[PDB]
Amino acid sequence: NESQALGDLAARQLANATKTVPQLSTITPRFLLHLLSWV
Amino acid sequence: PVEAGIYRVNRVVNPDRVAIHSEAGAGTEEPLPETYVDYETHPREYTLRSIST
Amino acid sequence: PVEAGIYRVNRVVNPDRVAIHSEAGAGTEEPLPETYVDYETHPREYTLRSIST
């Protein structure tokens, strides 16, 4: 169509995306390592 | 907070392909496994949507 | 407390007639809705009653 202003696709080329550190799905709370005493 | 309206979630692919070695007893001089952690090449990206009037 | 014995409770009428726009994806340049909040023209009024002897 006949756009009246700048679009989002063209405008986002000037913007920084927020990036997370990689997420690991195999992480568990590991309660046993906290319940035990270490000598 | 999202600084510019785009949020990218990076994820590890194939977590089962990271190889570790654990000895049960009488350790030997065998070579250790070599591995790395792989990432997804097309992570999901979230862009904020508007509610307005 | 009631300063002069009359208490008026004002209420909103037709709360479902307030129109909002929410986008699911790929926002466009369409016109936004125009709305307002309406009030009841005959609110209920409470006047204090006496218990005396």
TrEMBL record, chains B, C:
Highest taxon in the source lineage: Bacteria
Positions of transmembrane segments: none
Name by which UniProt lists this protein: Major membrane protein I
